[PDB]
Amino acid sequence: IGRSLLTYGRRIPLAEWESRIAEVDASVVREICSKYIYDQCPAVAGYGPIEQLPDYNRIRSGMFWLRF
C-alpha cells in the first residue's frame, strides 16, 4: 500500500495486473526486448579475480548478432 501510493499514486489491484499479464505474447516479448536490450551499451561491474572478464569492446559486440 505505502510503496504503491508513493510510486503510482494509487493501489493497483491484482485483477488489473492479471489483465495486463494476459495481453503479453511472444510478439510483444520480441518487440519490447528489442526496444531495451538489442544493440545497447551496458554498464558493467566486477569484483574478485576478474582477469578473465572480457574486455569492454568484446562485451559491447555481444549485444548484437551479425546474422540478423
Partner 1 sequence: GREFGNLTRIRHVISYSLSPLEQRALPHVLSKGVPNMLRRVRESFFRVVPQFVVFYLLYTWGTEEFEKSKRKNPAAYENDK
Ligand X SMILES: CCCCCCCCCCCCCCCCCC(=O)OC[C@H](COP(=O)([O-])OCC(O)COP(=O)([O-])OC[C@@H](COC(=O)CCCCCCCCCCCCCCCCC)OC(=O)CCCCCCCCCCCCCCCCC)OC(=O)CCCCCCCCCCCCCCCCC
How far are the Cα atoms of 9, 15, 25, 53, 64 from residue 38, in angstroms, in the given order?
Answer: 32, 32, 19, 21, 6
Cα separation, 24 vs 26, whole angstroms: 7
Q: Choose among partner 1, ligand X, none what residue 66 binds, the Cβ cut-off being 5 to 8 Å by kind.
A: ligand X
Which residue, 5 or 53, has its beta carbon nearer to partner 1? 53
Q: Choose among partner 1, ligand X, none what residue 8 binds, the Cβ cut-off being 5 to 8 Å by kind.
A: none
Q: Does 45 bind partner 1 (CB under 8 A)?
A: no
Q: Choose among ligand X, partner 1, none what residue 26 binds, the Cβ cut-off being 5 to 8 Å by kind.
A: none
Task: For residue 13, give the DSSP letter.
Answer: -
